[PDB]
Write an enzyme that holds these catalytic residues in place. Structure first.
Site, PDB file in Angstrom:
ATOM      1  N   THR A   4     -40.149  36.038  73.616  1.00  0.00           N
ATOM      2  CA  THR A   4     -38.754  35.256  74.102  1.00  0.00           C
ATOM      3  C   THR A   4     -37.808  34.766  73.006  1.00  0.00           C
ATOM      4  O   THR A   4     -38.573  34.753  71.984  1.00  0.00           O
ATOM      5  CB  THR A   4     -39.241  34.116  74.953  1.00  0.00           C
ATOM      6  OG1 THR A   4     -40.610  34.449  75.414  1.00  0.00           O
ATOM      7  CG2 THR A   4     -38.408  33.522  75.912  1.00  0.00           C
ATOM      8  N   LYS A  41     -30.161  40.925  86.137  1.00  0.00           N
ATOM      9  CA  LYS A  41     -31.413  40.107  85.767  1.00  0.00           C
ATOM     10  C   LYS A  41     -32.171  39.535  86.930  1.00  0.00           C
ATOM     11  O   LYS A  41     -31.744  38.528  87.623  1.00  0.00           O
ATOM     12  CB  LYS A  41     -30.639  38.849  84.958  1.00  0.00           C
ATOM     13  CG  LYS A  41     -31.559  37.770  84.643  1.00  0.00           C
ATOM     14  CD  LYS A  41     -32.332  37.910  83.116  1.00  0.00           C
ATOM     15  CE  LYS A  41     -32.960  36.888  82.554  1.00  0.00           C
ATOM     16  NZ  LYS A  41     -33.356  36.852  81.233  1.00  0.00           N
ATOM     17  N   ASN A  50     -45.264  44.489  63.782  1.00  0.00           N
ATOM     18  CA  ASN A  50     -46.482  44.127  64.773  1.00  0.00           C
ATOM     19  C   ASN A  50     -45.987  44.024  66.370  1.00  0.00           C
ATOM     20  O   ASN A  50     -46.310  44.868  67.078  1.00  0.00           O
ATOM     21  CB  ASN A  50     -47.670  43.202  64.445  1.00  0.00           C
ATOM     22  CG  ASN A  50     -48.327  42.903  65.539  1.00  0.00           C
ATOM     23  OD1 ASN A  50     -49.394  43.801  65.597  1.00  0.00           O
ATOM     24  ND2 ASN A  50     -48.755  41.735  66.120  1.00  0.00           N
ATOM     25  N   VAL A 104     -35.381  35.961  71.473  1.00  0.00           N
ATOM     26  CA  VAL A 104     -35.094  37.081  70.420  1.00  0.00           C
ATOM     27  C   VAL A 104     -33.681  37.274  70.540  1.00  0.00           C
ATOM     28  O   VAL A 104     -33.358  38.359  69.948  1.00  0.00           O
ATOM     29  CB  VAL A 104     -35.961  38.268  70.528  1.00  0.00           C
ATOM     30  CG1 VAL A 104     -37.641  37.718  70.398  1.00  0.00           C
ATOM     31  CG2 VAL A 104     -35.765  38.951  71.880  1.00  0.00           C
ATOM     32  N   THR A 163     -30.608  38.119  75.633  1.00  0.00           N
ATOM     33  CA  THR A 163     -29.355  38.131  76.708  1.00  0.00           C
ATOM     34  C   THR A 163     -28.188  38.586  75.980  1.00  0.00           C
ATOM     35  O   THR A 163     -27.285  39.139  76.572  1.00  0.00           O
ATOM     36  CB  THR A 163     -29.310  36.771  77.233  1.00  0.00           C
ATOM     37  OG1 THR A 163     -30.357  36.470  77.916  1.00  0.00           O
ATOM     38  CG2 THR A 163     -27.778  36.546  77.956  1.00  0.00           C
ATOM     39  N   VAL A 164     -28.043  38.114  74.718  1.00  0.00           N
ATOM     40  CA  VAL A 164     -26.588  38.231  74.063  1.00  0.00           C
ATOM     41  C   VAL A 164     -26.721  39.845  73.560  1.00  0.00           C
ATOM     42  O   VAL A 164     -25.333  40.473  73.551  1.00  0.00           O
ATOM     43  CB  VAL A 164     -26.566  37.121  73.061  1.00  0.00           C
ATOM     44  CG1 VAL A 164     -27.839  36.984  72.148  1.00  0.00           C
ATOM     45  CG2 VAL A 164     -25.387  37.536  71.879  1.00  0.00           C
ATOM     46  N   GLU A 212     -31.895  43.232  82.410  1.00  0.00           N
ATOM     47  CA  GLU A 212     -32.425  42.400  81.673  1.00  0.00           C
ATOM     48  C   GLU A 212     -33.682  41.736  81.818  1.00  0.00           C
ATOM     49  O   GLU A 212     -33.910  41.379  83.193  1.00  0.00           O
ATOM     50  CB  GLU A 212     -31.449  41.164  81.388  1.00  0.00           C
ATOM     51  CG  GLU A 212     -31.870  40.270  80.402  1.00  0.00           C
ATOM     52  CD  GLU A 212     -31.086  39.099  79.885  1.00  0.00           C
ATOM     53  OE1 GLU A 212     -31.462  37.933  79.622  1.00  0.00           O
ATOM     54  OE2 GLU A 212     -29.652  39.513  79.994  1.00  0.00           O
TER      55      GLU A 212
END
Lengths: 226, 227
Positions: free
Chosen positions: A12, A38, A148, A14, A17-18, A109
């Site tokens: 989350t 979405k 990772n 990160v 959305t943009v 999304e």
């Protein structure tokens, strides 16, 4: 069909959305028709409407969603706290499949990361990617831990033969930093980095954001999506 | 042989090291001989030393390192920066096997998360767990994003048939948020939650830390880790 792309993230916050807005804006400027689905939105009690974000930033009008939960939690958890089920697997797939049409890039999304529960029972964005035969664009960070997390996400993608559309760094810091610098090289050793979105791009006005977006992705790759 | 656990995490900064020390303390208080291993340690130029932290916290004296790098970056990038190379898979495996002994719990602390490259090419702690037939104990957070990160890690363990010894919430808030309580309940449906270490467990003197470690886990499960 057109092209259906799931846009997922390694976690989350990160910049997913943009990144959806940015890919949407780049694609529109290439003349591709763009829709964004979405299906499940959370954190709405405090304003979070990611589709509205996409609309404001990229001008998408085909913005499709099924469920909004107030709590700033994972979908399954926000539903539990609301006492209301999640949508059904069929709802999410049918909605996406009906958005998709020749010449249109349909972005899907996710909420949070790839394996967060989106529909009942226990169905993820990965499951939805399989049902609609979509490749996955993975939003990654440039910070420590991203390799990772990226390797984990691409392994999860590949276990279900979900193709990886590439990576997008959600926020590229300024100045980069040694770790950020090194991660950007390490990231491209394991997938194509389609873009590194400059840090702060969420604050741009629509015209600036469209200029940023068009410059952040390779022109030929974008137009080649449809 | 003995019991070898690799101690990994969903990411970096989730409290791995304090979880080794806490499990180390709980097992030594159980009369179990404990050794803690750290094949790749970065950030040495910052003072990062997880072996030393474990000893300082749990009084573990059998501490085994191998590779040390100055920069606090992923092992591969710390190596390149210092002009050094990562160890080889058989060097890591050799370091672990040399400590393995019946009645002893050997903990193998990873660098970062499960899929962090430890050796060339792409050798991770997961591979090292296969080579030495270790289970993975997975250190998680209570913060949002954790269920996804944990399912990815368990998925990657299972894909190589590395047993999951369970989960430890590295930092458990007092009192817990709606997000923290929700995740913990949800985490406990993914795998057994062996302990949720109280927040700030690293700032305890040896006395308070031993009492926390003993309370954090189930006696039964610790004692059952090794015959």
């Amino acid at each position: 069909g057109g092209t259906i792309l799931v846009v997922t993230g390694t976690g989350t916050g990160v910049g997913k959305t943009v990144v959806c807005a940015a890919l949407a804006s780049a694609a529109r400027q290439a003349g591709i028709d763009v829709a964004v689905c979405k299906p499940v939105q959370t954190g709405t009690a405090r304003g979070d409407d990611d589709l509205a974000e996409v609309g404001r930033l990229a001008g998408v009008t085909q913005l499709a969603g099924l469920a909004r939960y107030p709590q700033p939690m994972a979908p399954a958890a926000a539903a539990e706290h609301a006492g209301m089920a999640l949508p059904a697997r069929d709802q999410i797939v049918r909605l996406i499949a009906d958005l998709d049409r020749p010449g249109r890039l349909t972005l899907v999304e996710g909420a949070g990361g790839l394996l967060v529960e989106l529909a009942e029972p226990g169905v993820t964005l990965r499951d939805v990617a399989v049902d609609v035969a979509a490749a996955a664009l993975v939003v990654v960070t440039a910070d420590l831990g991203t390799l990772n997390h990226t390797k984990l996400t691409l392994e999860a993608l590949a276990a279900q033969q979900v193709s990886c559309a590439g990576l997008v760094i959600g926020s590229w810091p300024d100045p980069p930093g040694l770790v950020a610098a090194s991660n950007r090289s390490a990231l491209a050793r394991i997938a194509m980095v389609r873009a590194a979105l400059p840090a702060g791009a969420a604050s741009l006005d629509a015209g600036d954001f469209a200029a940023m977006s068009a410059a952040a992705f390779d022109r030929n790759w974008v137009a080649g999506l449809v």
